Design a protein around this ligand. Structure first.
Ligand SMILES: CCCCCCCCCCCCCCCCCC(=O)O
Ligand SMILES: *[C@@H]1O[C@H](CO)[C@@H](O)[C@H](O)[C@H]1NC(C)=O
Ligand SMILES: *[C@@H]1O[C@H](CO)[C@@H](O)[C@H](O)[C@H]1NC(C)=O
Ligand SMILES: *[C@@H]1O[C@H](CO)[C@@H](O)[C@H](O)[C@H]1NC(C)=O
Ligand SMILES: *Cc1nc(C*)nc(C*)n1
Lengths: 50, 296, 293, 14, 50, 50
C-alpha cells in the first residue's frame, strides 16, 4: 500500500499537467506560439498558479 | 558541511528549426479585399482559403483598414503561425454597425443578419468603402434583414423572403398593414455622414495548432536535424527538444500527438511526411557535497 | 418529376438496441495506450434506435423514407448488400421557403448541395433491370422539383457504381454521425464488412472524421433517400410498377455525454465507457479503468 | 428606386 | 417604470454609434428585469463621447 | 470536542459558499442570468477556484 500510494501520488502529479486551470490551454508552447508576451503572461500566470 | 540538491541537469538548444509545408502561391488578397462586388449582410459570402502563404504585408500598399481586431491570436504572432481551415466572410454594412461584428453583441445585424460565436478564433477587418459602394442618386443594392422572429445562431445564414407578421392579422403571403417584407435597402450616398456610409467587412476564421494546416505565414523553412536538442517550429507550433524517428502510425487527419500530460510529444513533418518523436533535453538531478565553505 | 408511390404495406415501426456503437474520434490528435475521457455529443450506450426496412416479400412491401427529427445530431447505420441507401435530406420545412442540404449518390458522382429545394413528398432514386442486356442502369432521380438562389455546391470525381440487385446476406455496414454546430455540418463515417441476415449487429467501431461542410443553415428534420428497382417483372405505372431491394437502416439520437475512450498501442479507439449509463460505468470512469475490483 | 416608398425593400423610405 | 424593455423597436430608426453596457451583457438584456431605471440625456461633442 | 469540531468544520464548509472570492457575486445563477458565457466564465472560474 505504501508503494502503491507513492506511485499513485507521483502519477497524479504527472497527470495534473494536462489541466487548464481556467487558462486557454495546458501546453506552454502552444500559448507562447499564439500570443504576445502580455496575454501569454496572463495565461502562463494561470498555469503557474494551478 | 553536507550534501545539497540543486537544479536538474539541463542541456541548452544548439540551433533553430522551422518546418512549414511546401506552398508557393500567395493568398488571394486581391480576390478577397479588392473584389469588384461585395455581398449583402443577410447573404454574406463565405470563401475557402487553402494552399497559400499569408503574407499580409502586400496589403500595406492599398489596404487602409479602419478596424482590425483578432480574437484567438495576437496579431504579432500572425507571421509565425499556420492556419488549418481558413474562411473569409465578406459583406457590406453601415458604419455604425461595425461594432456589432464582435462576439457577444446585440443589435439588428448581430441578431438577424450575421452572428459570431462566443468562442471565436479569427480576425475581423473592416474599412470604409464610400468611394466604391456609394453613388449620387443613392445605392440601394445592399440589403439587411430588419424583421425576424428569433435571433440567428452563430455562422447561420438566412436568405428567406417570407412576409413578416408584425401585428395580429395574418399576412397570407402578401404585404400590407403590419405585414412587412423582411429585407430592407441600405441608403448609401457620398454626402452621408460617417456611420451612415458603407463599410466593407471581411471576417477571417481559422483554427490553430490542433489539425494539419495548409495556409501558412511567410516563414522560410530550414533543414530538419535530428538527435540534437533544438528549438523547433512545426506548422506554427514552437518548442524545444530532441527530435528522433518514430514508429507511431498517424491517421491521415492527424498532425500532432500527445501523451498522458497532454504535451506535444509527436509530430508529422510537413515537408517529408514522417513521424518524429519530441523528447525534452533536460534530465537528471544534481547534488553537491561540501565539507563546508568555511573548511574548504 | 415527383411521383407518389403506392402498394405499400403498413406495419408498426420496429426498434432495436444500439449496444456500444456511435463512438467517433472527438479531435484530430493522436493518442496511444491511453484512457482519455471527453464530453461530446454521443449516442448513449444501449439506446433504443429505430429500425427501417426496404423489402419486397411478395407478401409485405416496405419502402421506408419518413421525415424524422434531427434533434442534437443523428447516428445513422445502414446494413446493405446492393447499394440502396444513396443519401439524405436535411432541413427545416423541406420546401422552397427555406434552405436545405442534399447529400446524394446518383451512381456516378457524390453531389452535396445546399439549396432551396422544393422537395417531393416521396423522393427516391431508381435502377432499371434490363433482361435483354443483363444490365442494371440508373433511370430515375426524383428528389426535388426546383433549386433556386443557392450557395454551396460540390460534385465529386466520377465513378462506376455497382447496381446489380444481389441476394443473400447483408454484406456492408455503413455508420455515420451527423452534427450541425456553428454553421458546420460535421460528418463522421466508418465502413465495416459484415455478413448477417437482419438486425443491427453488436460490436465496436470508431468513426473516423469524414468532412465538415460550412453550410450555415437551420436543420431540424431529415429524410433518407432510397433507390428502388424497376424491371419487366414489375409492371404498372410509375406509382405502382416498382419493387424494393432489401436493405435496413437504423436511426439514433445524440446527447451531450461524457465518454471514456481507450486508445491502444496503434492509436485506434478500441473500447469505450458511457459514464452516465449505470453506476458501474460511473465507477469505471472515476477509476480511469475498465476493470473494477 | 427598386420599389415605391413604403413597399418592398423601401419600407423605411422618405 | 412599469413598462416592457423591448428595444427591438429601436431597430427601425435609431442607428446608434456607441452602445456599451457595463454590469450586464447585452445579449442577456432581453431576459432580465430592471428595478430602478433612470435615463440621463445630454448633448456633447464627438471627442468627449469617450 | 470531536463531535463539535466535525460539525463546525462542516458548517464552515457550508457557510463558505457565500463568499465571492473576487468575483462579482456568490450565486451561480445570478451570474449566469446577467452575463453571456464569455463574461460569465471568468466569474465562474473565480468561484470554482475559491
Ligand atoms: C486573403 C485572405 C488570407 C487569410 C489568411 C489567414 C489569416 C492570417 C492573418 C491575415 C491578416 C489579415 C490582414 C491584416 C492586415 C493588417 C494591416 C493593418 O493593421 O493595417
Ligand atoms: C430553426 O427552425 C425551427 C423550425 O422551423 C424554428 O422553430 C427555429 O426558430 C429555427 N431556428 C432559428 C435560429 O431561427
Ligand atoms: C403527392 O402527395 C402530396 C401529399 O399527399 C401532395 O401534396 C402532392 O400533390 C402529391 N403529388 C402527386 C404528383 O400526386
Ligand atoms: C449525377 O449528378 C451529376 C451532378 O449533377 C451529373 O453531372 C451526372 O450526370 C449525374 N449522373 C447521373 C447518372 O444522373
Ligand atoms: C430611391 C429609393 N429607394 C429606396 C429603397 N428608398 C428610398 C428612400 N429611395
Amino acid at each position: 500500500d505504501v508503494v502503491n500510494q507513492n506511485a499513485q501520488a507521483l502519477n497524479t502529479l504527472v497527470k495534473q499537467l494536462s489541466s487548464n486551470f481556467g487558462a486557454i490551454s495546458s501546453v506552454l508552447n502552444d500559448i507562447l506560439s499564439r500570443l504576445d508576451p502580455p496575454e501569454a503572461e496572463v495565461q502562463i500566470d494561470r498555469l503557474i498558479t494551478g | 558541511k553536507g550534501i545539497y540538491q540543486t537544479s536538474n541537469f539541463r542541456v541548452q538548444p544548439t540551433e533553430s528549426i522551422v518546418r512549414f509545408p511546401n506552398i508557393t502561391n500567395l493568398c488571394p488578397f486581391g480576390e478577397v479585399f479588392n473584389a469588384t462586388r461585395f455581398a449583402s449582410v443577410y447573404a454574406w459570402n463565405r470563401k475557402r482559403i487553402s494552399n497559400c502563404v499569408a503574407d499580409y504585408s502586400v496589403l500595406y500598399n492599398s489596404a487602409s483598414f479602419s478596424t482590425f481586431k483578432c480574437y484567438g491570436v495576437s496579431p504579432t504572432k500572425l507571421n509565425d503561425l499556420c492556419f488549418t481551415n481558413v474562411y473569409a466572410d465578406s459583406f457590406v454594412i453601415r458604419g455604425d454597425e461595425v461594432r456589432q461584428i464582435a462576439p457577444g453583441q446585440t443589435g439588428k445585424i448581430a441578431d438577424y443578419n450575421y452572428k459570431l460565436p462566443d468562442d471565436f478564433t479569427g480576425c475581423v477587418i473592416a474599412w470604409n468603402s464610400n468611394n466604391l459602394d456609394s453613388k449620387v442618386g443613392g445605392n440601394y443594392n445592399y440589403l439587411y434583414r430588419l424583421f425576424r422572429k428569433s435571433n440567428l445562431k452563430p455562422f447561420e445564414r438566412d436568405i428567406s423572403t417570407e412576409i413578416y407578421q408584425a401585428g395580429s392579422t395574418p399576412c397570407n403571403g402578401v404585404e400590407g398593414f403590419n405585414c412587412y417584407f423582411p429585407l430592407q435597402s441600405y441608403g448609401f450616398q457620398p454626402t452621408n455622414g460617417v456611420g451612415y456610409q458603407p463599410y466593407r467587412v471581411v471576417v477571417l476564421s481559422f483554427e490553430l495548432l490542433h489539425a494539419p494546416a495548409t495556409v501558412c505565414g511567410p516563414k522560410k523553412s530550414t533543414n530538419l536535424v535530428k538527435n540534437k536538442c533544438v528549438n523547433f517550429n512545426f506548422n506554427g507550433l514552437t518548442g524545444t527538444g530532441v527530435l528522433t524517428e518514430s514508429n507511431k502510425k498517424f491517421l491521415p487527419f492527424q498532425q500532432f500527438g500527445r501523451d498522458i500530460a497532454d504535451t506535444t510529444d509527436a509530430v508529422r513533418d510537413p515537408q517529408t511526411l514522417e513521424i518524429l518523436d519530441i523528447t525534452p533535453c533536460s534530465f537528471g538531478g544534481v547534488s553537491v557535497i561540501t565539507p563546508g565553505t568555511n573548511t574548504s | 418529376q415527383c411521383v407518389n408511390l403506392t402498394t405499400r404495406t403498413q406495419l408498426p415501426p420496429a426498434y432495436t438496441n444500439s449496444f456500444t456503437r456511435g463512438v467517433y474520434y472527438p479531435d484530430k490528435v493522436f493518442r496511444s495506450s491511453v484512457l482519455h475521457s471527453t464530453q461530446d455529443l454521443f449516442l448513449p450506450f444501449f439506446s433504443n434506435v429505430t429500425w427501417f426496412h426496404a423489402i419486397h416479400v411478395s407478401g409485405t412491401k416496405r419502402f421506408d423514407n419518413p421525415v424524422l427529427p434531427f434533434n442534437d445530431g443523428v447516428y445513422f447505420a445502414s446494413t446493405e448488400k446492393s447499394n440502396i441507401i444513396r443519401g439524405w435530406i436535411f432541413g427545416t420545412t423541406l420546401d422552397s421557403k427555406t434552405q436545405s442540404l442534399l447529400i446524394v449518390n446518383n451512381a456516378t458522382n457524390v453531389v452535396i448541395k445546399v439549396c432551396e429545394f422544393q422537395f417531393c413528398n416521396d423522393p427516391f432514386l431508381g435502377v432499371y433491370y434490363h433482361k435483354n442486356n443483363k444490365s442494371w442502369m440508373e433511370s430515375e432521380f426524383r428528389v426535388y422539383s426546383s433549386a433556386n438562389n443557392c450557395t454551396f455546391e460540390y460534385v465529386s470525381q466520377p465513378f462506376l457504381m455497382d447496381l446489380e440487385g444481389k441476394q443473400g446476406n447483408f454484406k456492408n455496414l455503413r455508420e455515420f454521425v451527423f452534427k450541425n454546430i456553428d454553421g458546420y455540418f460535421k460528418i463522421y463515417s466508418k465502413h465495416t464488412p459484415i455478413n448477417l441476415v437482419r438486425d443491427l449487429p453488436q460490436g465496436f467501431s470508431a468513426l473516423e472524421p469524414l468532412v465538415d461542410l460550412p453550410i450555415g443553415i437551420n436543420i431540424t428534420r431529415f429524410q433518407t433517400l432510397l433507390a428502388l428497382h424497376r424491371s419487366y417483372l414489375t409492371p404498372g405505372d410509375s406509382s405502382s410498377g416498382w419493387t424494393a431491394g432489401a436493405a435496413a437502416y437504423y436511426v439514433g439520437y445524440l446527447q451531450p455525454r461524457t465518454f471514456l475512450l481507450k486508445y491502444n498501442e496503434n492509436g485506434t479507439i478500441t473500447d469505450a465507457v458511457d459514464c452516465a449509463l449505470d453506476p458501474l460505468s460511473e465507477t469505471k470512469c472515476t477509476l480511469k479503468s475498465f476493470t473494477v475490483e | 428606386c427598386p420599389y415605391v416608398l413604403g413597399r418592398x425593400t423601401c419600407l423605411x423610405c422618405a
